[PDB]
């Protein structure tokens, strides 16, 4: 059946958008191009590999016990900036246990227990994301009302935060920090006698997810030891929200129908991950890949295995891709075999090497600096909820490009404007922090270790990538950034106390 049906009505904005300040942002104006790409008929033929894998997943999920969150708990874990409800309350009311929000949530819950059929309304919107130079359309976000989003947490928060790591073990990508991800990948690579690996990424993964996939996910969740009420709500949520439902735009008009994965529900990330893991493990078996190890974050997959030779590997990946296509998930680009860990890119990121103070080799996670640089450029002009600059400084703090350019530029703009002690909002790992720039040294030490302030002798490929990137975007080269940073460091050190600590740790690399 069709991933989507459309009525004719447009996907409309809810606010003042802006598609430029080179660097652009996606808007609702481009939503029609996205609608085209994500609209198609799915075909799926399962086989005994798929079935054998699923059976093993269920046997693991059957050892998981999960509880209901109370309304109260679910209210307290609602994110502070999520969309206000149609029925008269917002995120802030939910979190402060307003009687209006609580009585309406209890009523949504009771309706889920009592009605297991009526499709549930979702709003469709175009996501506003900054990119770099061609132009890609806006991604679509599809979410139900806030009261339903609280009930999803009641039914499933304990399941989605416990089950996946038990079912997928070390392949569950979301349990790792960047350093931990690197350690998994490097250890896996070094365990093979002749390592080969590849990344796979599915072409419109949300749209490839079928009704059967979503029902299979529910059946995994029902292997858990759950309270009766939980089982009924999870079934009712599966039938009324997860498999499909109607879409309505920001102006309350009927946009169409969805018969595929919603991007804006609690189970999206866990479901996608479980479903990809299931099809990818089955596809490794069809392909007959030797000593296979997988890392999965949504539909981003790395596989690392024993090479069987050059032409053998190339053919084996074709058989893998064929199997994945039969299971409903063709790739955006065909996967390529790699014999260098550094060349495998997934979740937009890759492993690279540098040296610590003692001269020990140290592996760290990096990425192409183009999009992060563009995004930080945008937040120099405008101002966001997410502060992607700061998040990137935190997650990629050991990288050459974050230390030399991102850290430098932003502590300079902060000295200039005297905003050192002003806290900034910052979305990292699905949660919104209030970050004080002088807190960074401690945050980076906690996330990456002290070696992050001390790494040198980076790999020549990484240095050249940063350098080509600066040149392509019009930003000063690295010699300029070393000079500026000597200046920024000097100032911070004059300011004493905590700002002196920033200068000492964050810019120790600039000293002569
Ligand atoms: C004539 N030339 C210099 C003045 C204005 C400039 C406009 N451009 C292309 C930029 O500003 C590019 N750019 C950009 C930039 C612009 C667009 C996309 C990506 C980076 C940045 C970002 C780098 C990372 C921190 C955030 C600013 C930037 C920083 C400093 C400087 C600088 O010249 O000192 C330039 C930077 C063009
Ligand atoms: Mn994809
Ligand atoms: Mn992906």
Counting the structural domains of the chain, the total is 4
Residue 97 falls in which region: left (phi positive, over 0), alpha (psi -120 to 50) or beta: left
Query: What whole-number distance in Å separates Cα of residue 161 and Cα of residue 156?
Result: 8
Query: What whole-number distance in Å separates Cα of residue 331 and Cα of residue 198?
Result: 12
147 CA → ligand 3 middle, Å: 29
For residue 55, what are the contacts with CB-CB under 8 A and spacing of at least 6?
A: none
Helix (H) and strand (E) counts in the chain = 21, 14
The verdict on 35 and 72 lying in the same domain is no
383 CA → ligand 1 middle, Å: 16
Query: What whole-number distance in Å separates Cα of residue 176 and Cα of residue 170?
Result: 9
User: Is 300 annotated as a binding-site member?
Assistant: yes
Query: What whole-number distance in Å separates Cα of residue 380 and Cα of residue 195?
Result: 43
The verdict on 53 and 23 lying in the same domain is no
The verdict on 461 and 338 lying in the same domain is no
User: Minimum-distance ligand to the CA of 348?
Assistant: 3
Report whether 192 contacts 291 (CB < 8 A). Answer: yes
Q: Which atom of ligand 1 is nearest to the CA of 379?
A: 26
Dihedral, CA atoms, 302, 304, 310, 311, nearest 10 degrees?
A: -60
178 CA → ligand 2 middle, Å: 21
Out of 284, 313, 347, pick the residue that ends a domain: 347
- The DSSP bridge pattern shows strands 122-126 and 245-248 to be parallel
Residue to mutate (ligand 1; options 382, 413, 469, 475; most atoms within 8 A of CB): 475
511 CA → ligand 1 middle, Å: 24
The SS3 call for residue 307 is coil
Out of 278, 312, 347, pick the residue that ends a domain: 347
Bridge partners, residue 304, by sequence = 197, 293
Q: Convert 78-93 to b/e letters by CB count within 10 Å (16 or more is b).
A: beeebbebeeebbbeb
User: Is 299 annotated as a binding-site member?
Assistant: yes
User: Is 145 annotated as a binding-site member?
Assistant: no
298 CA → ligand 2 middle, Å: 9
| C-alpha distances in Å from residue 193, one per residue of 146, 308, 310, 319, 342 | 51, 11, 15, 23, 17
Angle separating helix axes 460-473 and 370-381, nearest 10 degrees? 40
User: Minimum-distance ligand to the CA of 333?
Assistant: 2
List phi, psi (to 5°) of 249. Answer: -80, 180
443 CA → ligand 1 middle, Å: 27
User: Residue 273 burial (CB < 10 Å; 0-12/13-18/19+)?
Assistant: buried
Q: How many CB atoms lie within 10 A of CB 313?
A: 23
For residue 259, what are the contacts with CB-CB under 8 A and spacing of at least 6?
A: 1, 2, 3, 4, 5, 211, 243, 244
Query: What whole-number distance in Å separates Cα of residue 348 and Cα of residue 367?
Result: 6
Bridge partners, residue 351, by sequence = 365
Query: What whole-number distance in Å separates Cα of residue 317 and Cα of residue 306?
Result: 13
Give me 97's structure tokens.
């246990």
Name the residue with tokens 């059957």.
62
Name the residue with tokens 């950034």.
481
**Smallest CA separation from ligand 1 atom 16, residue:** 377
Report whether 343 contacts 198 (CB < 8 A). Answer: no
107 CA → ligand 3 middle, Å: 36
* Sign (positive or negative) of CA dihedral 495, 498, 503, 508: positive
User: Residue 471 burial (CB < 10 Å; 0-12/13-18/19+)?
Assistant: exposed
The SS3 call for residue 480 is helix
The verdict on 304 and 431 lying in the same domain is no
Q: Convert 147-186 to b/e letters by CB count within 10 Å (16 or more is b).
A: bbbbbbbbbbbbbbebbbeebbeebbbbebebbebbebbe
Residue to mutate (ligand 1; options 474, 485, 487, 488; most atoms within 8 A of CB): 474
Report whether 197 contacts 307 (CB < 8 A). Answer: no
The verdict on 493 and 352 lying in the same domain is yes
Query: What whole-number distance in Å separates Cα of residue 388 and Cα of residue 372?
Result: 7
The SS3 call for residue 63 is coil
- CATH number assigned to the domain comprising residue 330: 3.30.70.270
All residues with CB under 5 Å from ion ligand 3: 201, 299-300
Nearest CA to 79 out of 428, 330, 366 is that of 428
**Smallest CA separation from ligand 1 atom 15, residue:** 377
User: Residue 15 burial (CB < 10 Å; 0-12/13-18/19+)?
Assistant: exposed
Q: Where are the alpha helices (DSSP H) in 388-439?
A: 388-395, 400-401, 408-416
Bridge partners, residue 123, by sequence = 143, 248
Query: What whole-number distance in Å separates Cα of residue 224 and Cα of residue 372?
Result: 40
The verdict on 56 and 149 lying in the same domain is yes
The verdict on 287 and 342 lying in the same domain is yes
Bridge partners, residue 434, by sequence = 425
Nearest CA to 386 out of 359, 425, 423 is that of 425
422 CA → ligand 1 middle, Å: 24
Out of 320, 347, 374, pick the residue that ends a domain: 347
Q: Which atom of ligand 1 is nearest to the CA of 410?
A: 25
Domain range holding 454?
A: 348-512
Report whether 231 contacts 328 (CB < 8 A). Answer: no
Q: How many CB atoms lie within 10 A of CB 420?
A: 16
346 CA → ligand 3 middle, Å: 8
The radius of gyration computed from the CA coordinates of the chain, to the nearest angstrom, equals 24
Nearest CA to 124 out of 272, 271, 264 is that of 264
Query: What whole-number distance in Å separates Cα of residue 342 and Cα of residue 356?
Result: 19
Determine the longest span between alpha carbons in the chain, in angstroms.
Answer: 71
The verdict on 338 and 421 lying in the same domain is no
Overall residue count recorded for the chain in this entry:
512
All residues with CB under 5 Å from ion ligand 2: 201-202, 205, 299
User: Minimum-distance ligand to the CA of 300?
Assistant: 3
Counting Cα atoms < 13 Å in the Cβ hemisphere of 190 gives 7
Residue 337 falls in which region: left (phi positive, over 0), alpha (psi -120 to 50) or beta: beta
Q: Convert 351-377 to b/e letters by CB count within 10 Å (16 or more is b).
A: bbbbbbeeeeebbbbbbbbbbbbbbbb
Query: What whole-number distance in Å separates Cα of residue 20 and Cα of residue 192?
Result: 48
Report whether 281 contacts 179 (CB < 8 A). Answer: no
Give me 109's structure tokens.
């819950």
Report whether 282 contacts 53 (CB < 8 A). Answer: yes
For residue 383, what are the contacts with CB-CB under 8 A and spacing of at least 6?
A: none
| C-alpha distances in Å from residue 9, one per residue of 24, 206, 250 | 25, 22, 11
The verdict on 112 and 161 lying in the same domain is yes
**Smallest CA separation from ligand 1 atom 6, residue:** 474
Eight-class DSSP state of 169? G
Name the residue with tokens 């192409």.
368
List phi, psi (to 5°) of 80. Answer: -65, -25
| Secondary structure (DSSP) of 107-120 | HHHHHHHH-SSS--
Angle separating helix axes 388-395 and 440-448, nearest 10 degrees? 40
Q: Which atom of ligand 1 is nearest to the CA of 484?
A: 34
Nearest CA to 507 out of 409, 414, 433, 420 is that of 409
Bridge partners, residue 367, by sequence = 349
Give me 418's structure tokens.
């005297």
Eight-class DSSP state of 407? I
SS3 content of the chain, % helix, strand, coil (to 5): 50, 15, 35
**Reported resolution, Å:** 2.4
Query: What whole-number distance in Å separates Cα of residue 275 and Cα of residue 314?
Result: 25
**Smallest CA separation from ligand 1 atom 11, residue:** 475
Query: What whole-number distance in Å separates Cα of residue 402 and Cα of residue 373?
Result: 9
Give me 42's structure tokens.
């799915």
Report whether 281 contacts 156 (CB < 8 A). Answer: no
Nearest CA to 185 out of 398, 374, 367, 342 is that of 342
Query: What whole-number distance in Å separates Cα of residue 366 and Cα of residue 458?
Result: 11
User: Residue 507 burial (CB < 10 Å; 0-12/13-18/19+)?
Assistant: buried
Give me 316's structure tokens.
């084996």
The verdict on 360 and 494 lying in the same domain is yes
Dihedral, CA atoms, 395, 400, 405, 406, nearest 10 degrees?
A: 0
List phi, psi (to 5°) of 17. Answer: -90, 175
Counting Cα atoms < 13 Å in the Cβ hemisphere of 337 gives 21
**Smallest CA separation from ligand 1 atom 19, residue:** 374
**Smallest CA separation from ligand 1 atom 28, residue:** 475
**Smallest CA separation from ligand 1 atom 34, residue:** 476
List phi, psi (to 5°) of 254. Answer: -80, 105
**Smallest CA separation from ligand 1 atom 29, residue:** 475
The verdict on 133 and 233 lying in the same domain is no
The verdict on 290 and 204 lying in the same domain is yes
Eight-class DSSP state of 397? T
Bridge partners, residue 65, by sequence = 225
Binding-site residues, ligand 1, Cβ < 6 A: 23, 373-374, 376-377, 380, 405-406, 409, 473-476
């Amino acid at each position: 059946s069709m991933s989507y049906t459309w009525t004719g009505a447009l996907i409309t904005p809810c606010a003042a958008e802006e598609s430029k300040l080179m660097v652009y942002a996606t808007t609702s104006r481009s939503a029609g191009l996205r609608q085209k790409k994500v609209t198609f008929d799915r075909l799926q033929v399962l086989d005994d590999h798929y079935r054998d894998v699923l059976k093993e997943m269920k046997a693991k999920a059957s050892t998981v016990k999960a509880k209901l969150l109370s309304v109260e708990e679910a209210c307290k874990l609602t994110p502070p900036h999520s969309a206000k409800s149609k029925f008269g309350y917002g995120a802030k009311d939910v979190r402060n246990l307003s009687s209006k929000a609580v009585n309406h949530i209890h009523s949504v819950w009771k309706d889920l227990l009592e009605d297991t059929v009526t499709p549930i309304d979702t709003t469709i919107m175009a996501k506003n994301e900054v990119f770099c130079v061609g132009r890609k359309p806006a991604r679509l976000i599809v979410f139900p009302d806030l009261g339903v989003r609280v009930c999803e947490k009641m039914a499933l928060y304990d399941v989605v935060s416990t089950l996946p790591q038990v079912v997928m073990g070390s392949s569950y990508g979301f349990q790792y920090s960047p350093g931990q991800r690197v350690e998994f990948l490097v250890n896996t690579w070094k365990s093979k006698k002749n390592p080969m690996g590849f990344s796979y990424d599915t072409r419109c993964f949300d749209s490839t997810v079928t009704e059967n996939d979503i029902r299979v996910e529910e059946s995994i969740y029902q292997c858990c030891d759950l309270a009766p009420e939980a089982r009924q709500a999870i079934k009712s949520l599966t039938e009324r929200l997860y498999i499909g439902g109607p879409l309505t735009n920001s102006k309350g008009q009927n946009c169409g129908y969805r018969r595929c994965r919603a991007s804006g529900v609690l189970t999206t990330s866990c479901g996608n991950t479980l479903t990809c893991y299931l099809k990818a493990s089955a596809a490794c078996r069809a392909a007959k890949l030797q000593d296979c190890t997988m890392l999965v974050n949504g539909d981003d997959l790395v596989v690392i295995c024993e090479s069987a030779g050059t032409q053998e590997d190339a053919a084996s990946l074709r058989v893998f891709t064929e199997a994945m296509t039969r299971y409903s998930a063709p790739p955006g680009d065909p996967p390529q075999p790699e014999y260098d860990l550094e060349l495998i890119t997934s979740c937009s990121s890759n492993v690279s090497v540098a040296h610590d103070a003692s001269g020990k080799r140290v592996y760290y996670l990096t990425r192409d600096p183009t999009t992060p640089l563009a995004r930080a450029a945008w937040e120099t002009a405008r101002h966001t909820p997410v502060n992607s600059w700061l998040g990137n400084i935190i997650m990629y703090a050991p990288t050459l490009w974050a230390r030399m350019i991102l850290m430098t530029h932003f502590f300079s703009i902060l000295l200039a404007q005297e905003q050192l002690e002003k806290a900034l909002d910052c979305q990292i790992y699905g949660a919104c922090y209030s970050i004080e720039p002088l807190d960074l040294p401690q945050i980076i030490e906690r996330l990456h270790g002290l070696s992050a302030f001390s790494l040198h002798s980076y790999s020549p490929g990484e240095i050249n990538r940063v350098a080509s990137c600066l040149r392509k975007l019009g930003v000063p080269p690295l010699r300029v950034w070393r000079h500026r940073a000597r200046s920024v460091r000097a100032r911070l050190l004059s300011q004493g106390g905590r700002a002196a600590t920033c200068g000492k740790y964050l810019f120790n690399w600039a000293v002569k």
